Amino acid sequence: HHMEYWHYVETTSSGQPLLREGEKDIFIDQSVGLYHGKSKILQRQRGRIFLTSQRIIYIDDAKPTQNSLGLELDDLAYVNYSSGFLTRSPRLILFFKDPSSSTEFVQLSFRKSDGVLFSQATERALENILTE
Amino acid sequence: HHMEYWHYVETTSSGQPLLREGEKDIFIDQSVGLYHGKSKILQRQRGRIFLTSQRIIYIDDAKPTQNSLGLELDDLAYVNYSSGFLTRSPRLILFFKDPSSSTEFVQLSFRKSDGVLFSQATERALENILT
Amino acid sequence: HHMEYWHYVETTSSGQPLLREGEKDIFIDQSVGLYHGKSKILQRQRGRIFLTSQRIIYIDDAKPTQNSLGLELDDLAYVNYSSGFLTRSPRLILFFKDPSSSTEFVQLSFRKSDGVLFSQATERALENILT
Amino acid sequence: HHMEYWHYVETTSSGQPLLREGEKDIFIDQSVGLYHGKSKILQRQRGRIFLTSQRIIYIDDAKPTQNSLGLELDDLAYVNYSSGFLTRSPRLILFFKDPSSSTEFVQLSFRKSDGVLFSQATERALENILTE
Numbered sequence: 363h364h365m366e367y368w369h370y371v372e373t374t375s376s377g378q379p380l381l382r383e384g385e386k387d388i389f390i391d392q393s394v395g396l397y398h399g400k401s402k403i404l405q406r407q408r409g410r411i412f413l414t415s416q417r418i419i420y421i422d423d424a425k426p427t428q429n430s431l432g433l434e435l436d437d438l439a440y441v442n443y444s445s446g447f448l449t450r451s452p453r454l455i456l457f458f459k460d461p462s463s464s465t466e467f468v469q470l471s472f473r474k475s476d477g478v479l480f481s482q483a484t485e486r487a488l489e490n491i492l493t494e
Numbered sequence: 495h496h497m498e499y500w501h502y503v504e505t506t507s508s509g510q511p512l513l514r515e516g517e518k519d520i521f522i523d524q525s526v527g528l529y530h531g532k533s534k535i536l537q538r539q540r541g542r543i544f545l546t547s548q549r550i551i552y553i554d555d556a557k558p559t560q561n562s563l564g565l566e567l568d569d570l571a572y573v574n575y576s577s578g579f580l581t582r583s584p585r586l587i588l589f590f591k592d593p594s595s596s597t598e599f600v601q602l603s604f605r606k607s608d609g610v611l612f613s614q615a616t617e618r619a620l621e622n623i624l625t
Numbered sequence: 626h627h628m629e630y631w632h633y634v635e636t637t638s639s640g641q642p643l644l645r646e647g648e649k650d651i652f653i654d655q656s657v658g659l660y661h662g663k664s665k666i667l668q669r670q671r672g673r674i675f676l677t678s679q680r681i682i683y684i685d686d687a688k689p690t691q692n693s694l695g696l697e698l699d700d701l702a703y704v705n706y707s708s709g710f711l712t713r714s715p716r717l718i719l720f721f722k723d724p725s726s727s728t729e730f731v732q733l734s735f736r737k738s739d740g741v742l743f744s745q746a747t748e749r750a751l752e753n754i755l756t
Numbered sequence: 757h758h759m760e761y762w763h764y765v766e767t768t769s770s771g772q773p774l775l776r777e778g779e780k781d782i783f784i785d786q787s788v789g790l791y792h793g794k795s796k797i798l799q800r801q802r803g804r805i806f807l808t809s810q811r812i813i814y815i816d817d818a819k820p821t822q823n824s825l826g827l828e829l830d831d832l833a834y835v836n837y838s839s840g841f842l843t844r845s846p847r848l849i850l851f852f853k854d855p856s857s858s859t860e861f862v863q864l865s866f867r868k869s870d871g872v873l874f875s876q877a878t879e880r881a882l883e884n885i886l887t888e
Contacts, residue, residue, distance in 0.1 A: 460571070464624065469711070476872065492593065724834070
């Protein structure tokens with residue numbers, strides 16, 4: 363289940379995430395869907411994606427105050443961009459430090475952008491945490 | 495930087511590695527080279543690669559008692575096979591649980607086989623450890 | 626759009642394809658599905674895949690005398706194996722010499738094998754035609 | 757040999773390509789190296805790359821009037837972007853309509869950019885020719 367790694371995120375009525383003390387937004391993209399391993403996360407297929415200094419946050423388009431999710435950058439070891447040759451959309455693949463299985467990873471799927479600026483910003487934000 | 499993750503492996507002159515208490519031989523392949531991230535590990539470009547129940551072990555062809563190295567399966571998180579379209583040889587990429595940088599990962603490069611059987615065995619060996 | 630590139634293949638009721646003058650059986654794999662570009666070919670999702678000296682032939686499991694198709698090796702330019710990290714199954718991707726669009730290419734999807742032996746045989750069969 | 761597919765291109769002293777009647781530049785990138793199949797093209801490792809309505813053109817940094825090369829878009833069937841996971845630089849892979857072997861293809865290697873805008877423009881320019 364994807365909830366071992368993802369946590370619930372509160373938002374305003376308008377779909378703005380409520381961020382932690384000193385947590386700052388770095389980048390945002392639109393119309394992103396989530397995967398857990400190779401499978402779509404049902405009902406989390408169209409949202410805005412936010413990168414912060416601490417987290418990747420998915421804000422559900424349809425029900426932002428219910429279906430929004432967060433992932434800690436501190437739980438990640440690598441991110442890898444995949445450009446959409448076999449997949450309909452380009453994908454950003456997130457690798458965890460401590461997966462329960464190699465089947466457990468996340469993907470962000472970009473339906474209205476190539477996802478390149480988001481992925482580049484995420485690579486940098488991850489590297490800042492890793493190198494410390 | 496590769497020595498953060500790999501350890502020295504004692505062998506014999508004929509290239510037989512010293513295994514641990516209860517550590518079992520699973521699969522071996524020949525003429526493998528090692529990468530650390532995108533770069534070749536310089537003195538480790540032609541060796542046998544050995545999968546055990548606990549480790550991946552590189553046994554150097556030219557200098558086995560000196561240049562042989564081991565990696566704990568317990569330090570890995572994911573594995574990915576790449577078939578060699580843009581690389582001279584197929585590659586098995588290994589991702590650490592705890593990399594100091596996301597530029598640090600392992601590749602095994604298969605110069606005289608396709609590396610499929612070795613990669614499949616490693617997938618299974620790693621999954622046994624994770625689960 | 627896939628019917629620009631694939632042709633109808635006559636079989637028998639037991640799923641044996643009608644081969645041409647001097648056309649020889651090279652390799653077969655089971656439980657394969659077909660793609661045209663990124664999309665599944667709808668009635669061609671479970672069949673045997675057959676490499677001959679001249680063609681790749683899909684023999685449909687459910688309706689072999691109706692839904693079986695052939696592709697000329699002479700219409701291909703490149704082949705690429707993808708190991709199935711993000712796809713449920715490994716894929717063999719085939720690139721046409723003369724695509725109407727660069728969105729048009731073939732995939733074979735291997736549901737009950739890794740497709741390596743079939744892919745390796747196809748690489749060789751295609752190279753024989755090209756050279 | 758890479759010269760079955762590539763042709764000589766004339767330039768000005770300053771390294772500006774001399775274009776055909778009605779041929780127009782679409783995009784340019786810098787610090788690109790060439791591959792023929794998996795191997796570097798020696799001495800064609802640092803140049804500007806130009807996309808035109810008809811061609812991809814490599815302008816050699818060191819000797820532009822001698823070592824510049826052109827490829828016809830009409831000789832291509834596909835282009836594929838590869839994002840630099842195993843390769844030091846991202847790559848744009850060019851597939852020919854009529855290779856003599858599957859070992860014969862070209863790569864553009866991007867040493868000072870991610871090559872994304874160039875690759876996107878090339879995909880579009882190719883598609884215009886293919887669809888006719």
